Design a binder for this molecule. Structure first.
Ligand code: FAD
Ligand code: FAD
Ligand code: VVV
Ligand code: VVV
Ligand code: ZN
Ligand code: ZN
Lengths: 230, 230
């Protein structure tokens, strides 16, 4: 029945390590016969700000602007900006969404934060029933593929940065799990810049390798225990 | 001495609950005789995207664009875009920085994430070495004044969202502490959209009342234990 993959990609430089990782995911998932689409946010000059431009025609309450309410009603009334709905159509059709980004301040770059803020609107991604286990994107897989400046040692529990999993919580749980995604284990490529050449080649190779059996994987249990506990 | 306060404010609607919490801070700090400046991000149409437009000089490596490297050298050389250096002057002069924002996906709205990505560059906010307790903003205070959709109850260890302190980690530790700020306890105003008129007025006056004695507070111990316990 085939599978559709969306890669949401947030790097300014096509020759970057992130670009290589995105390119390998494209090469390998396309080799398997999957339908692959990439949202190259910087190349699209993707709008990160949540503003009233995100609603076309006339606001639900033009006196006091409430982004959440107005985007909810806009979704229901098919009245959202086309950049947003173009993205929601790719997500709707995806079986798997991979986010490929460098870690910026223990989180996603603002351009990709703006994608999550604007694309994952109430009525599309969640509503009152239909959050966490029940969220509107249930059935879909999501996966963070993150590159870091810090070596793997810095990201241990008693290290300076604390555990990798500590920063994962707002993205995996607060965002992806909230919307119904099952979350595969994050791919974390530690510290590509302090190399080496061969060691960079090796991390790109390992991601490609993992993508081979991505469809065999089980989701993580997306829990406070998984992130912080023992 | 007296003191300088910068409020970095991220809400689209001046009549909003965020609007009121920013306005009471300006009013109370101004009443005390403090110097007060507000960076009203949406009104400034503040650029959230980290791009090569943020550097105007000869790039250190114009064949492969690396945002961290290029902004660090642009800072030393003074070729950063001026919107960034305008913010930096505000932070440099400040004794206290307050971030006033609605929680968006367990984090800051993208427009304010872009402020942290672009303004807190290497050379200015931190160096290597020169971070966490050696951060370049040592001696300044910071405070997150966050509003939520979820109730206090929802943000407890056994509630749907887990403890409120879990989502504070990337912002308090990975960003502010990393830059050397001493972090004051977060002001979290839970679920104003749900709350009654009296409860909302109550939340605004509790912030006003807290600001009366802010200069007397000790910072939090910004550690994994404060954040996750326990
Ligand atoms: C605003 C900001 C905030 C940040 N916050 C954090 C943080 O909170 N925590 C943290 O750890 N880090 C942080 N960083 C560091 C950041 O996460 C790293 O800079 C980034 O992940 C490096 O990945 P890259 O793709 O840009 O590396 P690149 O510099 O693009 O790649 C490294 C090398 O790989 C080469 N390359 C590309 N493809 C290949 C290939 N196939 N094989 C071999 N070599 C290849 C490149 O040419 C380059 O020499 C931050 C950086 C910035 C700018
Ligand atoms: C993209 C997105 C992501 C989100 N992610 C999360 C999340 O991860 N977790 C979560 O909990 N929530 C989330 N939310 C919900 C969001 O945090 C809240 O909607 C926001 O915190 C509420 O603050 P506000 O200023 O917008 O409230 P408002 O809607 O502006 O205020 C509520 C009421 O208070 C009134 N008010 C204004 N001033 C005063 C005053 N002086 N005295 C008394 N009343 C006053 C207003 O008139 C209004 O009637 C998200 C929302 C969006 C849009
Ligand atoms: C803002 O840039 C940041 C922020 C960080 O932590 C918050 C970082 N932590 C690390 O362990 C290693 C690096 C390199 C790093 C970094 O820049 C390269
Ligand atoms: C995407 O918007 C979000 C995301 C959330 O958690 C991620 C939320 N959690 C809550 O507890 C309560 C609310 C209102 C909420 C919210 O607004 C609808
Ligand atoms: Zn979860
Ligand atoms: Zn800390």
């Amino acid at each position: 029945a085939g599978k559709k993959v969306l890669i949401v990609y947030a790097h300014q430089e096509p020759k970057s390590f992130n670009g290589s990782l995105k390119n390998v995911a494209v090469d390998e998932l396309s080799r398997q016969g999957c339908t692959v689409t990439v949202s190259d946010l910087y190349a699209m000059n993707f709008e990160p700000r949540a503003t009233d431009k995100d609603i076309t025609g006339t606001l639900s309450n033009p006196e006091v602007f409430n982004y959440g309410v107005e985007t909810h009603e806009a979704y229901k009334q098919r009245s959202l900006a086309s950049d947003i709905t173009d993205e929601q159509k790719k997500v709707r059709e995806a079986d798997l969404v991979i986010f490929q980004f460098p870690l910026y301040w223990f989180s996603v770059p603002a351009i990709l934060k703006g994608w999550m803020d604007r694309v994952l609107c109430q009525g599309f991604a969640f509503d009152i029933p239909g959050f966490y286990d029940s969220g509107l994107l249930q059935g879909k897989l999501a996966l963070l593929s993150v590159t870091t400046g810090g070596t793997a040692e810095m990201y241990t529990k008693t290290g300076v940065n604390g555990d990798s999993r500590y920063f994962l919580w707002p993205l995996q749980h607060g965002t992806l799990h909230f919307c119904g995604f099952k979350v595969l284990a994050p791919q974390i490529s530690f510290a590509p810049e302090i190399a080496s050449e061969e060691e960079r080649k090796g991390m790109v190779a390992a991601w490609s390798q993992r993508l081979q059996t991505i469809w065999k994987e089980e989701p993580i249990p997306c829990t406070a225990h998984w992130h912080f506990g023992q």
